[PDB]
Every structure is written in structure tokens, then in C-alpha cells.
Amino acid sequence: EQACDICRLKKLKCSKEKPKCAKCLKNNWECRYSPKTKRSPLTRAHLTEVESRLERLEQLFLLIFPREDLDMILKMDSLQDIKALLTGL
Amino acid sequence: MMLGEHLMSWSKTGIIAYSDSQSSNANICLTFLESINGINWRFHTPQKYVLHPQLHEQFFYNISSIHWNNWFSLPGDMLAVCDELGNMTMLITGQRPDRATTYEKLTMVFQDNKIYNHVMPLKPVDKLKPMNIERKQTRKEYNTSILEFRWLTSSKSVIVSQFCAFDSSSNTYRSRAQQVPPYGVYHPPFIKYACLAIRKNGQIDFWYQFSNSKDHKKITLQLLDTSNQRFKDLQWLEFARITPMNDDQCMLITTYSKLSKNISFYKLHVNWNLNDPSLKIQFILSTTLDPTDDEGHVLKLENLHVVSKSSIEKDPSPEILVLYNVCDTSKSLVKRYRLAPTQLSYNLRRHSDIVLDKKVTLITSEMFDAFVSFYFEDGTIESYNQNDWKLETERLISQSQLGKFKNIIASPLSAGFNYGKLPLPPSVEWMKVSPSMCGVIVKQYNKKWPQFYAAVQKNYADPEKDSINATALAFGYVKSLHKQISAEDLTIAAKTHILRISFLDRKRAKEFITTLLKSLYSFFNISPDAPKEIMDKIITSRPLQKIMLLQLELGSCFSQENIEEMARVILYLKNVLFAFNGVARNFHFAIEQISNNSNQQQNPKLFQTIFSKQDLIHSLIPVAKWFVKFITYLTQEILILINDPTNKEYTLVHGIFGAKMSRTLILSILNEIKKVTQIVAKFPETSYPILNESSTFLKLVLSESPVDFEKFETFLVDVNNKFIALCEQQPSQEREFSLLVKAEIPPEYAKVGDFLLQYANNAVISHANAAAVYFADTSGLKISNSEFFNPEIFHLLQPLEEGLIIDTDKLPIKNRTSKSFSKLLYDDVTCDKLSVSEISDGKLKRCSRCGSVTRAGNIISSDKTIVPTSIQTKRWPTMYTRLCICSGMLFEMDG
DNA sequence: CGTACGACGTCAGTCAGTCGGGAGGACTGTCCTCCGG
Ligand SMILES: [Zn+2]
Ligand SMILES: [Zn+2]
């Protein structure tokens, strides 16, 4: 089943043979089969672990700071910004 | 009384800023080292300035300490001086509010009293009008009196070397360089800078500036964070030494309060993460000092110096060196303590006691060297290494020679170069060992100028020690380049020893240079016998601007010798390299700008863009004249050498062709010249025919040259191939050094020398005018040193016993200014004649190293432009505003 | 001097190649009902 890295990236049929394969072989490229990427399980128990801890950190957050701040953090991607937020106390 | 440990500071760029306490109109002075006549040296004219708290819009106060920001990897240009009142005045040099300036002109950033921003360029006192400022003496030690000032480094890493050892297997010295990760407290990039100061009352300060703003901020605390202000204002700290520790964001504030008679320890913590950094303090430990020794003699604490120790050493705990003197006895005891955590199954553990036979009057810690200097009463200095506290000047005698690594050398002081009889400390205002430990700076009460003392060696008549000495001085520069130090002190010391050698045997001194510079290549892992790929890296390398400068000074005394001439022509060819290939890349990008910006012709931005395109090529014409004038000189020597091959005074011609990268370098210059001409022919100027003169002149000067470039191109190409097959015929690596530095052919290769004479005649001269080239006027090339300095001073002025450095007062009356030192006739960067207007305007610069004079970095007059106009254009000479061609510093020439 | 022919340059059109939206579909795991223990 697994297509080689390059065929994946390019989205063309892979011959998939061993070691290399038609277009990496032909075209002159180093053909690889990368490991599947580890992702979190998409189960319902796990979505619920995570929604319900996020909820409880939100509940605790609100005893400490205003709701308007909740909404800012819940969007920040930068670690300086998450820290500065906290520094304006 | 304790000496002025921080009265003077040698900036990493060579500027010597020291406190002034005698002039009634100034409190600070600036100076630097410059070469008199290529052999001797003298300090520059003192640039006096006055510092008072009210520069922002009148009495001025004395200067307490001067701290250049040369710590770690900092640029070392921002000088912050703290006065006796406690005000911290920050001065930035090398920058102006509107433009860039040289390193001898100051500028303010902000003044502290509350802090406010006020940018203002300072002016010298002598040039300024007589002002109503009197020297008010603040003889009171205020609560805000700063005890110790410390700078904060950035996140950059520093790579230095620790030591070298003699590899007896290969009979050569080998050195290893270890990268030093930052330790202690470092400020993040988004903060422009930060600094810390401890005041005598215990109040701390933290100045910092945000990189995205101009406003400055200050945060202050107090050490004794008690609930009562009664004890807050009591901590009169006798000694407050701040030593950063490997703990993150921690500084060990080792203080000695005489109120409680204990050496109290503290810890300071800072959280960088745009919010202001938070400062925290935590008390740790306090101990009492020992009253007596083992035999029953009481002790007195003279000084408390703690060493700034990194994590490299075996035990990173800082050494608290509490000095004690046995009264009425010449002995002096230095007890050593270390701070360590208390372990279960903090505290101070005593390691050992060290006895010194003379009383100590000053202690100074070296930077990036790990050397404690004991300035005894009799003037002698015994620098003990931090690793083992073994005397550096006597380590060779007591070294265990047997072992894997033999003859461990860290500095030229290990060889035996000891300082002479220094002036007694009572007469001395302040001392400071030079950064390379080659000499000591002494400021005298009755001497209006700084003195200088170099190291001497008693056994100069023994020839067998030349092998060790050359290697020892070779490693001295290795540490200096890694720390970006000018190392002008080390250059003076090397020349004095060579001069004493040449007085007895001139032949011996020449070999000393060759062996000395050879070890530099081995230490830095650069090989002149390597394949051609590394050779390209060599040409662009900064060290050649300095290592070649070494023989430029170490070979100056040898008149009619080609050691300095060979280095200068290669060095000037590098300047020639920066001319064409420096603009060939710039001109290439201008081709693409034409096509993409052809859709808007009437815009007011294209017209200035079009004008600048054809103006740049005009300034290359004066450079090309010296380019042609240079190749004719070597061709002229070909005809002369054929008749008389036995003339040793004309051996420079051999080395020039022997250099391997020079043949390729000229070929590359000829390659881009062909490319530029082909591109200009392919893409000529069509909108304005009047602007085609510069483009047309470029074609004409090449065709009208007395010798065809194509014939000369094949000349150097054939030499490379013949010199490569000879390497395969017999393997040898000294010939690579000989063709590059010695500019000679070894006697074992005498047959090779005959080939150059015979083949050069029929190759290129057959296509040129023989009669014309011989009588051609190639004079004024500024190649020899004799035609750089004026003939009045181009000689030795004082005997070698009196030293090599000369005070200005001994110079002739007409030769006591920098204007009379050199020939101010020709330019050195653009290779253009200097008119009377450019001479008299005082906007030209002189190099303190090689004596060169250049008006680079300034707007050119309208008569030198393509068309006389008042439009100001920033020309390429702006690259050398602060750095000369030989990596020396450029300064405004005094009028 | 005027006309004609040739050569070069520029523009347009067509073809190929590549990034991309996403169809196809085996599969993972959900989330019902309700069996039978
Ligand atoms: Zn594939
Ligand atoms: Zn593949």
C-alpha cells in the first residue's frame, strides 16, 4: 500500500517495488518509505479526555483572570505572547 | 593605598580611554597607538573631553571608573563611564545621528541623574570655546557611589583556545581550540543592551534599552530587603565583586560589610521574559575571616578578589582569594576558598594556602586569559595561572617534560620574556598589564604622556632557543584573533627581540621570521600546501590583513629588502581585488534592475537611478590607471633581470610570480574585466549618449595599454602548470612558503630559477615594445616604505637600549605632527591624485598601522564627478570609513 | 533616389509539465440496537 515519499509529495502512482521504484529509479532519485506519522487517537474517549481537561483549565483560569483574557490565550501561538500575557498580571 | 584598578580601559579596537585628573578643562582622554616611520611607534594626540551631569542642555565632577563594553563577544564601542557622584554617562563612538563616523569621535545616548533620551554629538575641549566649567571635586562617597560595574553579554557564543603542546612525534607544536558556551547572565536579542551596577549603599541598578524603542528604562532595588529603612541605608560595602556563576541568570554578589565584619554572599536572579525583566535577590551565606596563621602571625585582609570562573575548569566554584599580609614580614598569604553546596549522607571549603615573598599592591584579572596578576612592591609581576597556580614565567623549568604532551605553552610569557625594572608604584598613578601580557602600561605623575615597557630576554646570545621562541609568539596571536583583539602590544615586543638578533647576525634574524609565521598556519589549521580549493578561502580570509601586516612591521628595519614589499603588493592586490570584483557583483545586479523598471520612465526616482548607473563606472578609471601601472613594473624587472641574474636586490620578482593564488586572482580579474566589457558591449547606454564616455573610456584604456592583456594572461597561466608538475616530480611543502612569503627559491632548486629568466623573454615581450617599457614612468607606485614616510624621519631615532616606542616630544619640531609624517600626494584606495582642495579641507584619513593616507568615506568634490553638480552621492569609499586596507583603524587627520 | 528583398526581432499561440483540489475507497472507530447468560 505505502507510496514512496516523493510519489506522495508529487501525487503520481507509485510502482512501490523493492528497494526503489520506477520514477525514483528512472528519474534518478533516492526513493524512501518514511514511517507513518504518530497522531493522537481519534476516539471518542480521547476527544472527551481532552475536551474535558480543556474545560476545567478554562474554569480555573476564570477564577484568576478575566474572561476577555481567556479568549486571547485560547488563540495565541507564540510562547512570548503567552508569557507576557501573564506578566501584565 | 589601593591603585586605580578601573581608571583605564583598553577597548578591544585599540582606543585607550583613561581617567584624567590633572587638566582643569577635561576629565577624560582618548588616544591610541600609531606607527612613526614603520619601525618605531608613538601614542596618538590626546583627545580631551569634559563630562558634566548637565550636558543635556555648570560644574563637572571627577571620573570614578571607565568600562569599555569589551566583555565576551560584545562589539566594544559603547563606553559607559560612571562619575564620582554616581551618574552613569553612556558614550557611543563610531556613530553619528545622521551618518557613520570614525572611532575617535564620540556621541551620547542618554544621561542618568530619572533617565531621559537626548542624542547629541560631543566635541573636543580644545576645539570648543572657553566655557564656564570648573573642576568641582565630589570628595563625598554617596549612597549612589557605584562600587563595581559589570556589563551583560548577548546570546552569541565565543570560540577561543586553551593551550598548546609540543608533539614530539612530529616535532611540531599542536594547539586545540574549544568553544566556550555563554555562562552567567546574558541578555536576549530583543533587548539592545543591559548593564548592572552596585552602589556603595547596597542599592542596585539595571539599565536596559529596548531594540524597538529609544526610551530607556531603569529598575532599582536594595540588597538588604528588611522591613526597616534604618538598616536599608546602612550596608556600606567595602568590596562588592560580582562573579557570574553557571547557575542560570545568577550572579554571586560577594560583599564584605565591615558593619558585621563578615564576608556575606548573595544571589541575584533575573527573568528576561515585551515585559520588563523581573529582579530577585536571595541571601545565601556569611563567614568570618581567619585571624591568625599556623605559626602564630596575625593577618589583615588587604583585598578580596574573586575570579570569574566558567564551567570549563574542573571545579567551577569561584576562587575567593582573600589576601592577607603578615605584618613586619615580607611574606604575603593568599588563602583560597570555594563555595559549594552542602551535601547529605552551602559551605566554604578551604583548599590550600599560598605564600608570596613580596607584598601585593594591585590585583587585575585578565580577560579571556584566566590569569591573576600580582603587582608586587618592587615592580615585578608574577602572573599565576588559574588552573594550577604555577608561575607562568618559570613553568618551563619546573615542567615534567616526560609524558604524551610536552612543553605546554599558553603565552609568550612562558618562554621567559620578563618585564624590566618598572617604576615604583608610589610614583605611578595606575598600571595595567597589556592584554597579551607582552608589556605593561604605566602612567606617571610628571609624564604628560603614557609610557610603555616591553619584555626582555637575558639569554639572547643562545641560538638553540629560537625554535621555542618563534612558536611561543606564534600562539600569542592565535588567542588574540579569536578574541578579536588588535594585539598591537604583542607586535612591538616581537620586533625588539628581532632587532637585537639582527645587530649581531643579520642572516639569523631572517630565518626567525620564516619559522615564526609558519606556525601560525599550523595552529589555525590552514595549509599553504593544500589543494587549490582551500586557496580561494585564503584570499577572502581576514587574517591576511593582519598576519601579512606582521612582517610589514617586523621587516621594516631591513632596508632594500623584499620581505615587506612582497606582503604589501599582495595586500594591495587585495585592495585591488576589492575594487573590481567588489563592484563586479554590484554592477551585475544593475542589469536586472533596468528591465523590470522600464515601465515608468517619467518617475523622479528613475532619473537619479539612471544617473548613478553611469557615475559609478567613472570612479573605476583612477583605479585602473594603477592597475596598468602595476603590471608594467613587474614586466620592466623581467628585462633588467635577464642581463644580471646575480643581483640579489631584485629578488622580489621571483616571489610575485611564484604566488599560486595571485596568478589565479589576476586571471579572475581579467575574467571579470572581459565579462564587464562583454556585458557593457551587450548592454550599452542608449538613452543618453553623453554618459557613454565612461563606458567608452573603459574599452579604450584596455586597448591602449602598452602590453596586451591577452598575451599577459597566457603568461601567468603557463607558470601555474609548470609549477604544478614540479611538485609531482619531487614532493616539497617549503616551496609553497618560499613562493608566497620568502619571495626566494631555495638553493636546492637553483635550476628552477633559471627557467623564469629564459622563458619570460620570448613569451610576452615579443608582442610589446621593449624600448617603451624600459623607459616607462612607473615611479610613484607607493610599494616601498621609503616612499611612504618622509625622508626626515625614515631612520632609527633612538638606541635599542632606550626601547622601541618614542615619545612625541623627542621628534623634530617640523616632524611633530601627523601631517609631516607621510607623503600626502597620492590616494591609496581609489588610486587617484590628491588636489590641493582635498588636502586642505581636513576630511582625509590616515592609517595608524601602515602610514597610508586616504580620503575614503567622504563625499567627493564636484570636479571629480562626471558633471559638476551639487548632488551628493555615497561612493564605494564608504566601505573603509573605519577600517583601513590593512585592517588598521582610520582616523581624522589633524590640521 | 526609390523599390524590393532578406533578415532579425517581437508577439502570439500551442503544447507540455507541474502543483493542487480532491475522488476513490479501505479502514478505524462510533454508537446504536437488543441478544442471551
Ligand atoms: Zn514511488
Ligand atoms: Zn520512489
A1, closest nucleotide (Cα–C1'): C26
Report how far residue B491's alpha carbon sits from residue B479's, in angstroms, rounded to the nearest whole number. 14
Could you tell me if B110 and B90 are in contact, meaning their C-beta atoms sit under 8 angstroms apart? yes
Tell me the chain A residues in contact with residue B273 when contact means C-beta distances shorter than 8 Å.
Answer: 80, 83-84
Question: Torsion angle of alpha carbons A47, A52, A55, A60, nearest 10°?
Answer: -140
**Which strand (E) or helix (H) includes residue B637?**
helix B604-643
Report the candidate in B122, B82, B382 with the shortest Cα–Cα distance to residue B205.
B82
**Which strand (E) or helix (H) includes residue B661?**
helix B660-682
Q: Is B36 exposed, middle or buried (0-12, 13-18, 19+ CB in 10 A)?
A: buried
Residue A35 CA to ligand 2 centre (angstroms): 14
Q: What is the largest CA-CA distance in chain A?
A: 64
DSSP annotation of B673: H
Report how far residue B827's alpha carbon sits from residue B834's, in angstroms, rounded to the nearest whole number. 6
Q: Is B649 exposed, middle or buried (0-12, 13-18, 19+ CB in 10 A)?
A: exposed
For an interface test with A, the pick among B275, B276, B279 (most A C-beta atoms closer than 10 Å) comes out as B275
Half-sphere exposure of B883 (CA within 13 A, CB side): 10
Report how far residue B107's alpha carbon sits from residue B94's, in angstroms, rounded to the nearest whole number. 8
Q: Is the bond leading into B277 cis (omega within 30 degrees of zero)?
A: no
Quick one: CA dihedral B757, B758, B764, B768, positive or negative?
Answer: positive
CB contact under 8 A, A88 and B274: no
Could you tell me if B396 and B412 are in contact, meaning their C-beta atoms sit under 8 angstroms apart? no
Q: Is B219 exposed, middle or buried (0-12, 13-18, 19+ CB in 10 A)?
A: middle
Distance B613 CA to C9 C1' (A): 27
Could you tell me if B396 and B416 are in contact, meaning their C-beta atoms sit under 8 angstroms apart? yes
Tell me how many residue pairs between chain A and chain B have CB atoms under 8 A apart: 9
A85 is in an annotated binding site: no
Report how far residue B502's alpha carbon sits from residue B556's, in angstroms, rounded to the nearest whole number. 12
Q: Does A84 touch chain B (CB under 8 A)?
A: yes
DSSP annotation of B87: -
Report how far residue B758's alpha carbon sits from residue B74's, in angstroms, rounded to the nearest whole number. 56
Report how far residue B160's alpha carbon sits from residue B480's, in angstroms, rounded to the nearest whole number. 9
For an interface test with B, the pick among A79, A80, A85 (most B C-beta atoms closer than 10 Å) comes out as A80
Cell digits for B584? 563586479
Report the candidate in B194, B209, B94 with the shortest Cα–Cα distance to residue B149.
B194
Q: What is the C-alpha end-to-end distance of chain A, expressed in Å?
A: 54
Residue A7 CA to ligand 2 centre (angstroms): 6
The ligand that comes nearest to the alpha carbon of residue A14 is 1
For an interface test with A, the pick among B211, B271, B273, B279 (most A C-beta atoms closer than 10 Å) comes out as B273
Nearest chain B residue to A80 by CA distance is B273
A61 is in an annotated binding site: no
Could you tell me if B679 and B673 are in contact, meaning their C-beta atoms sit under 8 angstroms apart? no
Q: What is the DSSP string of B496-526?
A: HHHHHHHHH-HHHHHHHHHHHHHHHHHHTT-
Distance A48 CA to C34 C1' (A): 26
Residues pairing with B439 in the sheet? B454
Q: Which residue is it, cell 586596507?
A: B885
A59 is in an annotated binding site: no
Distance B21 CA to C26 C1' (A): 90
A25 is in an annotated binding site: no
Q: Is B604 exposed, middle or buried (0-12, 13-18, 19+ CB in 10 A)?
A: exposed
Q: Which residue is it, cell 545586479?
A: B589
- Closest approach of B276 to chain A, Cα-based (Å): 9
Give the SS3 label for residue B126. coil
Q: What are the C-alpha distances in Å from B525 to residues B518, B538, B823?
A: 11, 12, 39
Cell digits for B747? 638553493
Give the SS3 label for residue B15. coil
Report the candidate in B372, B373, B375, B371 with the shortest Cα–Cα distance to residue B358.
B375
Report how far residue B830's alpha carbon sits from residue B625's, in angstroms, rounded to the nearest whole number. 10
Cell digits for B496? 625588539
Report how far residue B855's alpha carbon sits from residue B834's, in angstroms, rounded to the nearest whole number. 9
Report the candidate in B232, B247, B238, B251 with the shortest Cα–Cα distance to residue B194.
B251
Enter the resolution in angstroms. 3.3
DSSP annotation of B655: H
Query: Which bases of chain C are contacted by protein, using any atom under 7 A from a CB?
Result: 19-22, 29-31
Report how far residue B641's alpha carbon sits from residue A26's, in angstroms, rounded to the nearest whole number. 63
Q: Which residue is it, cell 597561466?
A: B717
CB contact under 8 A, A83 and B273: yes
Could you tell me if B520 and B478 are in contact, meaning their C-beta atoms sit under 8 angstroms apart? yes
Report how far residue B479's alpha carbon sits from residue B492's, in angstroms, rounded to the nearest whole number. 17
Angle made by CA atoms B795, B797, B801, in degrees to the nearest 5? 125
A24 is in an annotated binding site: yes
Cell digits for B480? 588574540
Cell digits for B53? 551631569
Could you tell me if B241 and B258 are in contact, meaning their C-beta atoms sit under 8 angstroms apart? no
B21 sits in the region (left: phi over 0; alpha: psi -120 to 50; else beta) called: alpha
Report the candidate in A78, A86, A73 with the shortest Cα–Cα distance to residue B190.
A78
Q: Which residue is nearest to nucleotide C31 (CA to C1')?
A: A44
- The experimental method behind these coordinates is cryo-EM
Half-sphere exposure of B179 (CA within 13 A, CB side): 4
Residue B108 CA to ligand 1 centre (angstroms): 65
Report how far residue A79's alpha carbon sits from residue A84's, in angstroms, rounded to the nearest whole number. 9
Cell digits for B498? 628581532
Could you tell me if B26 and B451 are in contact, meaning their C-beta atoms sit under 8 angstroms apart? no
Report how far residue B251's alpha carbon sits from residue B279's, in angstroms, rounded to the nearest whole number. 12
Q: Is B643 exposed, middle or buried (0-12, 13-18, 19+ CB in 10 A)?
A: exposed
Distance B677 CA to C13 C1' (A): 38
Could you tell me if B73 and B183 are in contact, meaning their C-beta atoms sit under 8 angstroms apart? no
Residues of B numbered 267-296 whose beta carbons fall under 8 angstroms of chain A's beta carbons: which are they?
273-275
